Amino acid sequence: ELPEDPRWELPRDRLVLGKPLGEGAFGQVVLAEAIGLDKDKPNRVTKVAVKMLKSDATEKDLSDLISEMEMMKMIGKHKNIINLLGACTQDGPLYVIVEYASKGNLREYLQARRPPEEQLSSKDLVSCAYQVARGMEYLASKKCIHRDLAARNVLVTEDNVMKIADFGLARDIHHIDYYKKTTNGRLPVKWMAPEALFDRIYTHQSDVWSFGVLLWEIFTLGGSPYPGVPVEELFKLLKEGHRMDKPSNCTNELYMMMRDCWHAVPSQRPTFKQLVEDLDRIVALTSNQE
Ligand SMILES: COc1cccc(Cc2c[nH]c3ncccc23)c1
């Protein structure tokens, strides 16, 4: 049933499947070892992540996983996104092979580095924002709107590189359940721009608003936005023009950046291009401590 694409296909026997990854937040995904991923080095093994359909998947689940893969083929490569590396589409279940992120999602990474391993410098945190802003600038330049940019959808590699995940996910925005929670217990509506939340209008500008929430997540080291606030109350806060408080140990400039990202008028928010330039400059002048 699936079309062959020699640009991406890996023989099924080259992939040694392993243990589950991401505790189900990204669907059925496992760690694997791929033999001879690079055609130049056929005797090298690479740790990779591998997405597949759950046992009782419908035909729409298959379509959605295919869309995701094709979206990823078109978007191209970037250091700060989770890149496609291959696929097994023939004679067997569909496998979508992507880059492996050994240090987990950014929320977890930050939480484990709180003072009670190695604590993060002010520069490491800004550097973190910068890398994510870079991934997003690239995605935006390729006409991709994320729709759920958040710390949970940012993965961290063994070398502390931030990579945006799930940027090509299929989703029917007219059928979102605003009350559904992420497995960790939070509500995705808390990262959504008002225009996306009330009028279902997703744009690069609404992704920029989500980035503001993510900046707040970085500077609270994995803090939870609007803790205890249920959906109806969140709407009321948004309608009243409410904005989250400045995190402690966040400069006035970075708080102002968050606020700009939460501009009530979408046209007035910065773009990712501008955010990358601003963050580059702030990284250069932020203390590593020494
Ligand atoms: C494009 O983003 C994706 C696509 C497929 C799967 C995933 C989850 C994932 C990829 N690499 C990982 N490494 C560790 C934990 C989860 C993951 C993200």
Swiss-Prot record:
Q: How is it modified after translation?
A: Autophosphorylated. Binding of FGF family members together with heparan sulfate proteoglycan or heparin promotes receptor dimerization and autophosphorylation on tyrosine residues. Autophosphorylation occurs in trans between the two FGFR molecules present in the dimer and proceeds in a highly ordered manner. Initial autophosphorylation at Tyr-178 increases the kinase activity by a factor of 50 to 100.
Write out the tissue specificity statement of the associated record: Detected in astrocytoma, neuroblastoma and adrenal cortex cell lines. Some isoforms are detected in foreskin fibroblast cell lines, however isoform 17, isoform 18 and isoform 19 are not detected in these cells.
Q: What is the effect of changing residue 178 to F?
A: No effect on kinase activity. Loss of autophosphorylation and kinase activity
Where does it live in the cell? Cell membrane; Nucleus; Cytoplasm, Cytosol; Cytoplasmic vesicle
In the record, Phosphotyrosine modifications are located at: 178-179, 255
Q: Which residues form the active site?
A: 148
Effect on the protein upon substituting residue 147 to G: In HH2; with severe ear anomalies
The residues the record assigns to binding ATP are: 21-27, 51, 99-101, 105, 152, 166
Show where the Protein kinase domain sits. Answer: 15-290
Changing residue 20 to T: reported impact?
In HH2; phenotype consistent with Kallmann syndrome; the patient also carries a rare variant in SPRY4
> Consequence of mutating residue 179 to F?
Reduced kinase activity. Loss of autophosphorylation and kinase activity
Changing residue 143 to N: reported impact? In HH2; some patients also carry GNRHR mutations; impairs tyrosine kinase activity
Note the effect listed for residue 83 to K.
Answer: In ECCL; somatic mutation; activating mutation; strongly increased speed of the first autophosphorylation and loss of the normal sequential order of autophosphorylation
Topological domain (Cytoplasmic) residues are: 1-290
**Result of changing residue 134 to V:** Abolishes interaction with PLCG1
What the entry says about domains is:
The second and third Ig-like domains directly interact with fibroblast growth factors (FGF) and heparan sulfate proteoglycans. Isoforms lacking the first Ig-like domain have higher affinity for fibroblast growth factors (FGF) and heparan sulfate proteoglycans than isoforms with all three Ig-like domains.
So what family is this one in? Belongs to the protein kinase superfamily. Tyr protein kinase family. Fibroblast growth factor receptor subfamily.
The subunit structure is:
Monomer. Homodimer after ligand binding. Interacts predominantly with FGF1 and FGF2, but can also interact with FGF3, FGF4, FGF5, FGF6, FGF8, FGF10, FGF19, FGF21, FGF22 and FGF23 (in vitro). Ligand specificity is determined by tissue-specific expression of isoforms, and differences in the third Ig-like domain are crucial for ligand specificity. Affinity for fibroblast growth factors (FGFs) is increased by heparan sulfate glycosaminoglycans that function as coreceptors. Likewise, KLB increases the affinity for FGF19, FGF21 and FGF23.
Q: Which disease is it linked to?
A: Pfeiffer syndrome: A syndrome characterized by the association of craniosynostosis, broad and deviated thumbs and big toes, and partial syndactyly of the fingers and toes. Three subtypes are known: mild autosomal dominant form (type 1); cloverleaf skull, elbow ankylosis, early death, sporadic (type 2); craniosynostosis, early demise, sporadic (type 3). Hypogonadotropic hypogonadism 2 with or without anosmia: A disorder characterized by absent or incomplete sexual maturation by the age of 18 years, in conjunction with low levels of circulating gonadotropins and testosterone and no other abnormalities of the hypothalamic-pituitary axis. In some cases, it is associated with non-reproductive phenotypes, such as anosmia, cleft palate, and sensorineural hearing loss. Anosmia or hyposmia is related to the absence or hypoplasia of the olfactory bulbs and tracts.
**What's this protein's function?**
Tyrosine-protein kinase that acts as a cell-surface receptor for fibroblast growth factors and plays an essential role in the regulation of embryonic development, cell proliferation, differentiation and migration. Required for normal mesoderm patterning and correct axial organization during embryonic development, normal skeletogenesis and normal development of the gonadotropin-releasing hormone (GnRH) neuronal system. Phosphorylates PLCG1, FRS2, GAB1 and SHB. Ligand binding leads to the activation of several signaling cascades.
Q: State the protein's name.
A: Fibroblast growth factor receptor 1
Q: What is the lineage of its organism?
A: Eukaryota, Metazoa, Chordata, Craniata, Vertebrata
The shown residues of the full protein are 464 to 765 of 822
